[PDB]
A paper describes a structure:
pmcBRDT, a testis-specific bromodomain-containing protein, along with BRD2, BRD3, and BRD4, are members of the bromodomain and extraterminal (BET) family, and each protein contains two tandem bromodomains. In analogous fashion, it is the first bromodomain of BRDT (BRDT-BD1) that has been shown to be specifically essential for fertility in mice. However, more significant structural differences exist between BD1 and BD2 themselves that can be exploited for selective ligand development to either domain. Here, we demonstrate the discovery of a DEC-Tec inhibitor series that is both potent and highly selective for BET BD1 subfamily members versus BD2.
Numbering used by the authors: 28 to 136
Write the structure that this text describes.
């Protein structure tokens, strides 16, 4: 694992996982269970922290930018599907500020 990919795994993913708002994002969205109509019609690329975790574990990414794109897809999926000011959006926004902070502190390429 690349120097930056290892940071994304051992710092960024770890710190997002430990954040008190991350639990809804630690597994695929169960739209049936959560009663989210049309979720998988509206979201053309689902993403969650466990999928990113396993992609890092399985050496799926060739570049750190590809992993960063998946994190961003998580957050943008949430903002696209849910109303602004919904709890899940407010939690995602706080999680996302932590994520961008950790990118600011990433070792350069
Ligand atoms: C006593 N239980 C509380 O009250 C909780 C209720 C929350 C309801 C929504 N959830 C779900 O898992 C259900 C759900 C709904 C739509 C979703 N749509 C998707 O796309 C993807 C997902 C996976 C999704 C999942 C998180 C729990 N809410 C909070 O804990 C809480 C924490 C912090 C804030 C906050 C307020 C202002 C500023 C910043 C943060 C608000 N609420």
């Amino acid at each position: 694992l690349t120097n930056q990919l290892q940071y994304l795994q051992k710092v960024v993913l770890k710190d997002l996982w430990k954040h008190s708002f991350s639990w809804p994002f630690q597994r695929p969205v169960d739209a049936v269970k959560l009663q989210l109509p049309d979720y998988y019609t509206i979201i053309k690329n689902p993403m969650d922290l466990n999928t990113i975790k396993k992609r890092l574990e399985n050496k799926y990414y060739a570049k750190a930018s590809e992993c960063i794109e998946d994190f961003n897809t998580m957050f943008s999926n949430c903002y696209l599907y849910n109303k602004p000011g919904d709890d899940i959006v407010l939690m995602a926004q706080a999680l996302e500020k932590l994520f961008m902070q950790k990118l600011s502190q990433m070792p350069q390429e």
